[PDB]
Amino acid sequence: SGDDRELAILATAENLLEDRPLADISVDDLAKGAGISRPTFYFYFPSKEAVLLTLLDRVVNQADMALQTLAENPADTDRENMWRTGINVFFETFGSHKAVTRAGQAARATSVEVAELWSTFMQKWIAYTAAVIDAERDRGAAPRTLPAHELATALNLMNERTLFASFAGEQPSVPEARVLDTLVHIWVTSIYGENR
Amino acid sequence: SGDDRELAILATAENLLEDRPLADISVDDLAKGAGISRPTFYFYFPSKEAVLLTLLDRVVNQADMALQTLAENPADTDRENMWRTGINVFFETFGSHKAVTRAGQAARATSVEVAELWSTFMQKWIAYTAAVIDAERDRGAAPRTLPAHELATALNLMNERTLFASFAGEQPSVPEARVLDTLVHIWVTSIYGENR
Ligand SMILES: CCCc1cc(C(=O)n2cc3cnn(CCO)c3c2)no1
Ligand SMILES: CCCc1cc(C(=O)n2cc3cnn(CCO)c3c2)no1
């Protein structure tokens, strides 16, 4: 069937990207994994690059839907926990799909569609962050220091670079078992910290 | 002469990278700019990729030497200024060589030598940051909150990603005229901010 063969292709690709990068994975490898022929592959996708775009789109929307769920239901907690739970959506969602994350970031250089997808969602997440900061200031809990959108931008770019370094075991990187605490500290201190 | 023709090659390359990426720049373009023949080019460098490595090495060492100069002579100032002056070395050095910065970051994906160069200097800068944090804690000015090396790592990765986004005018990015204040705020609040 249609959905079924498409889903097999996507599953095969996610599995193979755990062992090697996209440039070392052939359309034949994808077709063989999904139990189809090569020209049947080309009915569902034009290129192996398109398969990666679809996988990345799935993961990014997963994160975005999780964040939306959280935005609807507040945990009954203190401000530090509020931010930890939110950053954790990204830590768990992308950390549960490390191969797709790593491949997707590398594709930003060579694929205008992948760059645009990542840009679009980063803008959305920055805007949301800035809206929460603005709410915290309006209720008197956070000081009016930097422009909230500029602060949100830098904190979100920190998380993009730091999470993906950690997941890839780059040198340098924060260890994966430390990265959530590290990021939460920097978000909380910079959002709530006053000018001396 | 030897140094002279090498320097012309490097100058030509830095000029051409302002207009286009390395993949659209030929060895003939480099040789023509430097007033030499193609095989004379190959006496001084093996590839256009090697030229970029040399340019990047120059810029990274420029920044590192500037930071060393600062580490020798303290400004007579408050703590926020101490960090601003130091972050400004990177803002001015890389911001004065935007084409080389942009090309060098893109080459990290395809060049093990470029990745290793950037890794080596990031480790050095992180270690230095962490040593200053540790000094600030030992004198009683900064609280003992996160592991200083993990904090330094995330702050330095923030700056890498945020500065290069700003210089490239990426969407999203902090405007270049705002990025120094934004980064300094987040470093100062996270280094000096207490646990509530
Ligand atoms: C590979 C992860 C890329 C990434 C992570 C993040 C991130 O950690 N966040 C996006 C956010 C939008 N809102 N929040 C916290 C809101 O409480 C967010 C954190 N932004 O980009
Ligand atoms: C394209 C710039 C990449 C970059 C910038 C930085 C950076 O902003 N810094 C490196 C640092 C080492 N020490 N400091 C501040 C010390 O007072 C530093 C800031 N690290 O990597």
From Swiss-Prot, chains A, B:
Organism superkingdom: Bacteria
Sites marked Inhibitor-binding: N156, N159
Gene Ontology cellular component annotations, sorted alphabetically: cytosol
Domain named HTH tetR-type: residues: 3-63
GO MF terms held by the record: DNA-binding transcription factor activity; transcription cis-regulatory region binding
Stated regulation of activity: Inhibited by tert-butyl 4-(3-thiophen-2-yl-1,2,4-oxadiazol-5-yl) piperidine-1-carboxylate (RF1) and 1-(thiophen-2-ylacetyl)-4-(3-thiophen-2-yl-1,2,4-oxadiazol-5-yl)piperidine (RF3).
Disruption phenotype: Cells lacking this gene leads to ETH hypersentivity.
Function per UniProt: Involved in the repression of the monooxygenase EthA which is responsible of the formation of the active metabolite of ethionamide (ETH).
Quaternary assembly: Homodimer.
Name used for this protein in its record: HTH-type transcriptional regulator EthR
Provenance organism: Mycobacterium tuberculosis (strain ATCC 25618 / H37Rv)
